[PDB]
């Protein structure tokens, strides 16, 4: 759930040391590799050296996070972190000392900056946006996410909504459980009939994920409804020539329709077209990743515990 290209540069310490991080609405901790991680993966990424920062303070607290295909262990420090033109002082930063796992081998980011609720933060870790809200460094207690449909995009706006990135009106959906950015999806219909999320379901908006995940049974119904066929890689593909005649998949959220066109829910790479839906056999949680967010400019409002959606430019 960390394969999206929703990265950004951040700066930590005095003078600033630069890192690339995935901005992840599916988690809540900030961490980057430290100079004390000596593995190949770490040595060939940016590593924070606390000895070189005059504002660094060691918290005397550990951090350990497990991922599907890896884990990180490290230590926590305070330092100044700059993100999207906001300078965030006295910010807890996780600093890796080990990073086993394929996830880090195959990911271009140095670290992760979580944007979910503090309930998901590790012990002793304070989420970046929480620290910013607490210190009153943002104009409003919300942030906004634009992902450009074509090629690694594009913007994280902290403390504001940027109307230049959407058309039509912003519509709001209440958060149901304040951990992930979680809410109710009412239905998923295709060709005007119920296919998935029948009777409603729980979903999250997850900027860290490239695809759209759902329970396997429901997802298989979607693959069949869109005319996709399973291949030997375990993915589902379609004839690119059929995109013009394929159906829209409609996510209904708080009673309004959020259609995904065939071009939006498939990937086309040198004439090979694959479904952006992926099934999970061990979870009923729908994960609306970049497939969805590329189509819908997304506002994450902590003051009012709600998500705002509008059609992206
Ligand atoms: C903020 O950080 C400074 C050092 O940078 C420290 O002296 C101070 O105690 C911190 N403030 C709080 C409220 O933790």
Numbering used by the authors: 11 to 323
Sentences from the paper on this structure:
Bovine and camel chymosin are aspartic peptidases that are used industrially in cheese production. They cleave the Phe105-Met106 bond of the milk protein κ-casein, releasing its predominantly negatively charged C-terminus, which leads to the separation of the milk into curds and whey. Despite having 85% sequence identity, camel chymosin shows a 70% higher milk-clotting activity than bovine chymosin towards bovine milk. The substrate-binding cleft and active site are located at the interface of the two domains.
The doubly glycosylated variant 2 was used for the crystallization of camel chymosin. The crystals obtained by crystallization of variant 2 contained a protein lacking the first three residues of the N-terminus. The higher mobility of the loop containing Asn291 could explain why it was not possible to identify any carbohydrate bound to Asn291 in the electron density, even though mass spectrometry of the crystals had shown that camel chymosin was glycosylated at both sites. The disordered N-terminus of camel chymosin implies that this structure lacks one of the strands, which leads to a breakdown of the pseudo-twofold symmetry that relates the two domains of the chymosin structure. In camel chymosin it blocks a major part of the binding cleft and must undergo a conformational change upon binding of substrate. The lack of hydrogen-bond partners for the β-strand formed by residues Leu166–Leu168 is compensated in camel chymosin by a slight displacement of the loop formed by residues 93–96, which enables the side chain of Ser94 to form a hydrogen bond to the carbonyl group of Leu166, thus connecting the β-strand to the loop 93–96.
